Amino acid sequence: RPIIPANLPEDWQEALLPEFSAPYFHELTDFLRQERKEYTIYPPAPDVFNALRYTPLGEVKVLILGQDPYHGPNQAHGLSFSVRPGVRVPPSLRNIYKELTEDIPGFVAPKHGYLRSWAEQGVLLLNAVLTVRAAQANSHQGKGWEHFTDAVIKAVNAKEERVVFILWGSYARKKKKLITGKNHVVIESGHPSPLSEQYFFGTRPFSKTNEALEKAGRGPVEWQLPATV
DNA sequence: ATCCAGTCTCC
DNA sequence: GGAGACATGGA
Ligand SMILES: [Cl-]
Numbered sequence: 001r002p003i004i005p006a007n008l009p010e011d012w013q014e015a016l017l018p019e020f021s022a023p024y025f026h027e028l029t030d031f032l033r034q035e036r037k038e039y040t041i042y043p044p045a046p047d048v049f050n051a052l053r054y055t056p057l058g059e060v061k062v063l064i065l066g067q068d069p070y071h072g073p074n075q076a077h078g079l080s081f082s083v084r085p086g087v088r089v090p091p092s093l094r095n096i097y098k099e100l101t102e103d104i105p106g107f108v109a110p111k112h113g114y115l116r117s118w119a120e121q122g123v124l125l126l127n128a129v130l131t132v133r134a135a136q137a138n139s140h141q142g143k144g145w146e147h148f149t150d151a152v153i154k155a156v157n158a159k160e161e162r163v164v165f166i167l168w169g170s171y172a173r174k175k176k177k178l179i180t181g182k183n184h185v186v187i188e189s190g191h192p193s194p195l196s197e198q199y200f201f202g203t204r205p206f207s208k209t210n211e212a213l214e215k216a217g218r219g220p221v222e223w224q225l226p227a228t229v
Numbered sequence: 230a231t232c233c234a235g236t237c238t239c240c
Numbered sequence: 241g242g243a244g245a246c247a248t249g250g251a
Contacts, residue, residue, distance in 0.1 A: 091233090
């Protein structure tokens, strides 16, 4: 039987039905059940598909693709790079904020790390791999997620209206060949982790995104976050 | 003071 | 991919 996540927007359910029905996805699911039995796996299972829940396929105008979820306790909750109200801003997101402060005039980094207000504007906050074992970055690489996130990329690429794809890191950048739509734009760099920050700083992805959207008659993203959440 | 938050080079 | 070099600014 297909293993279909609950409460997805209908457009995602229709686009991704073949994935939820596929043998590779059944095998990925079985592996993840074993992993959750034997280890602490992030994010919590109810949150794994939250990026799709918060940004319907029809609303996507920017697709941010990181590597894999944050791998410490109470960090990841399915929107890449985001943390819940109350949670310390992780290093990657501190670096995102540093780059925004330089790239977008007037951006003021808030004390929180909650990025829901970006998802609500059409920014799909994805990672190439959607789960991780505690303390072990990229521990779930190469187990089936990449086929599923290829399918997500492909569904967005099939849209006619311009989407900006921002590929952060080597693993996310493997998706570049799938982005063939004539109206789409790809921005790529190193990941914003402090361990790769020399490959991220100065790449101006936020302004480049807004310029591309504007030239296509799409509205820019409001990158400023609320001061409190 | 230690620990802990990627990607390049050769084979 | 494997092994190692070089990767950081804070709690
Ligand atoms: Cl994440």
